Design a protein around this ligand. Structure first.
Ligand SMILES: [Mg+2]
Ligand SMILES: [Mg+2]
Ligand SMILES: [Zn+2]
Ligand SMILES: [Zn+2]
Ligand SMILES: [Zn+2]
Ligand SMILES: [Zn+2]
Ligand SMILES: [Zn+2]
Ligand SMILES: [Zn+2]
Lengths: 439, 439
């Protein structure tokens, strides 16, 4: 007599991530109470289980949700607002003045919600969020059942979010207390950048991150000019200064990291630092060339993120992964750099580990949360199918995602979003388009 | 009383390419006998015309078909066959031996046909094809109503296509004679590479290309090792040798061009040479960094191509354009390089001009052929819509293409392919997958 479980998903291919470079043909995944309870051949699964419901996708690959390890998601409302302009013109004359005019709880809620639809439609199931009004974001992600590490911004300058150091840290503390032990939402400190966060604020982040047990999410070594300005002001590269401040350790999520030495690579490896690679943003802003292959081979935990929609301009992790994989080869002058399996690992388990969720998501293993994605591979764009891992990285587009679950709850069903209305989303986006136009 | 025309396409946005950087809101395009006969505000068009049929796409951008200016389209059957391997292992141990085993008219016809479906579904309407069995390819493109400049391969080594110099040139001559004055298919010489084509064969291409009035389609300066091997063998960089052979002129389509000097840039500008940029292939093979911004600002006609599906691994020109645009900024250390309008220009009119079709395709102007694409912009992935050109380059995915016409004939209608059956295409691709597996 079969054993009950809540859901059985049968697929043409299961890609567990752990073990590495393995593809399980004709396998199924059983789920109960949001948790993965079995991964096994589909014939073996049909004898073993009496699922309350079964989902069969014989043409699809089933893999863990992609983990977008660096977002500013309300900026979906600023999609393409200021393209093809140098960084300081982009920021000073476009991004900051628009943000100043529009940032508040409504803007953050609507932009985050728009991002959640875009992320689900493209098979992303978790984010490492970095934006003002983190309180609203956490609530929005939680309401939609979407997984997130939500950062509390710390910066030396006043904004609508907080006008003083004490206020930024009071908000951070409130965010952490509200979300302690939540299964979907965790919290992090997000000091903005080495050039916008003073030594005293960095010291306070170090102390509170240890006290409250939170990661530290930091834009680091993103540009040549950042490194040079740091030498002028502090006599030291930023990583050297952060090291002396006590911020280079197994809590640090270092984003961008385009300007780097070997010492620094092994520094990151020894201390347990994660690097988030955002290649499309880096290329588009002319920030430089993160040595992703060097970091990966030095055993630095590597994740992949998109950054925001004013410098990408999409949240497409399938694209981001492909860009990471092909750029890594050219930068390293080495065609074996960041192979398909390794890149897919970074996009799932690498991101999971960077956000401190490594034990709960990122691979299809018994006991982990059922954050899962079906990618249709029967589309002619992904045929013939010589190698499934190759196909997911170098040929599949994000529109081939057909089904998405987060903690076993259906979020996208045959390309349809559950409890979201795309028409209302689009109408809301047009309002914001008009408001920004007046600024 | 209204004036008759065959077809009126009404769209939310018309992007004519000529004039540059212009977007016509709420405009229509009238077409008769496959030719564009008017471009004008939709209200003005409804009073003027009595179309036999009208297509209304109020949420869409209408633009010229994308021109993929470098393909090896039968290699769609080799999609992902050998990823993450260095160039000489890729070629010698995988690509050449598989091609040797499978190349023939059936393989070329099936692979080309597969590519035509993928290209149409992604809004590509013209190719610059470079493969064995060009006779079969020309016939296949013509049968599907798909525009192509089809190259006759010239190479010093025997293959199933031709076993001697005389045979390669006899085939080339036959191809040209069969397709003279065809409105859809034109022909070019395709000497393979400087290192596979001897001086005598290059001389023969120069003479026949002038005599028969054909372009010359040549992989040029693709790799460091190509340039160095040339210095060893000929005492000269390859462009210097081709210059002395008389091949650097207004017939040359130079593909890849990753290894380049300034002299060479101005050389190309002075002589009317077109460069085809294939960024994704270049990055994936670690070939290097074509100075696309440098070439464009030096007035070198620049086009964009995908190369083949064993080194991309898709035929996605929306992606290729985005990669070209963002890579150009990082390579040039200049965020204003290859802006959205300029990149879109390269993808349409630049390709048109590279293939010698500049007077017939590449912009929405009266008198040109009605090769047109509707891109749905109402998808949330492309909202809010702050700038249409930005959106087409940095956010739109190829699955947002909804309708495609070539010479005014519908090829893709609401994502449905006309006179193609995707299921048969997929079944055929699986056969080839099995055959290759045995090699
Ligand atoms: Mg992107
Ligand atoms: Mg591609
Ligand atoms: Zn805590
Ligand atoms: Zn950024
Ligand atoms: Zn950022
Ligand atoms: Zn002729
Ligand atoms: Zn190639
Ligand atoms: Zn090629």
């Amino acid at each position: 007599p079969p054993e009950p479980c809540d859901l059985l998903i049968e697929a043409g291919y299961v890609v567990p991530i752990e073990p590495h470079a393995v593809v399980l043909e004709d396998h199924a995944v059983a789920v109960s109470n949001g948790v993965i309870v079995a991964v096994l051949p589909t014939a073996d699964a049909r004898v073993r289980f009496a699922p309350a419901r079964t989902v069969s996708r014989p043409d699809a690959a089933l893999m863990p949700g992609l983990v977008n390890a660096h977002t500013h998601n309300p900026m979906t409302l600023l999609r393409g607002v200021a393209d093809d302009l140098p960084l300081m013109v982009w920021l000073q004359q476009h991004i900051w003045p628009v943000e100043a005019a529009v940032i508040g709880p409504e803007f953050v809620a609507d932009g985050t919600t728009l991002a959640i639809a875009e992320m689900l439609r493209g098979g992303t199931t978790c984010v490492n969020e970095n934006y003002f009004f983190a309180d609203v974001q956490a609530a929005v992600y939680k309401q939609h059942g979407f997984r997130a590490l939500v950062g509390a911004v710390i910066i030396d300058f006043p904004t609508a979010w907080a006008s003083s150091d004490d206020e930024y840290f009071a908000r951070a503390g409130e965010l952490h207390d509200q979300w302690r032990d939540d299964p979907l939402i965790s919290t992090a400190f997000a000091p903005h950048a080495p050039y916008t966060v003073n030594d005293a604020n960095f010291e306070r982040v170090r102390m509170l991150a240890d006290q409250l047990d939170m990661p530290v999410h930091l834009h680091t070594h993103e540009t040549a000019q950042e490194v040079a300005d740091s030498v002028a002001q502090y006599g030291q590269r930023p990583l050297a200064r952060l090291d002396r401040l006590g911020l280079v350790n197994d809590r640090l999520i270092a984003v961008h990291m385009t300007q780097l030495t070997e010492a620094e690579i092994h520094l990151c490896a020894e201390r347990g630092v994660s690097v988030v690679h955002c290649p499309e943003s880096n290329l588009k802003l002319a920030s430089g060339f993160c040595p992703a292959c060097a970091l990966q081979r030095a055993s630095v935990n590597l994740a992949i993120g998109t950054d925001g929609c004013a410098s990408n301009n999409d949240l497409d992790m399938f694209s981001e992964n492909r860009t990471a994989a092909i750029l890594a080869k050219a930068v390293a002058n080495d065609a074996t750099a960041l192979d398909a399996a390794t890149t897919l690992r970074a996009a799932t388990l690498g991101g999971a580990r960077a956000l401190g969720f490594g034990d709960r998501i990122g691979s299809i293993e018994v006991g982990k949360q059922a954050d899962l994605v079906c990618v249709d591979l029967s589309a002619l764009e992904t045929q013939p199918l010589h190698h499934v891992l190759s196909q997911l990285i170098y040929a599949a587009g994000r529109h081939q995602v057909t089904d998405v679950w987060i903690a076993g709850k259906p979020k996208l069903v045959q390309r349809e979003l559950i409890d979201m209305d795309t028409a209302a989303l689009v109408a809301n986006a047009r309002q914001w388009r008009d408001r920004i136009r007046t600024v």
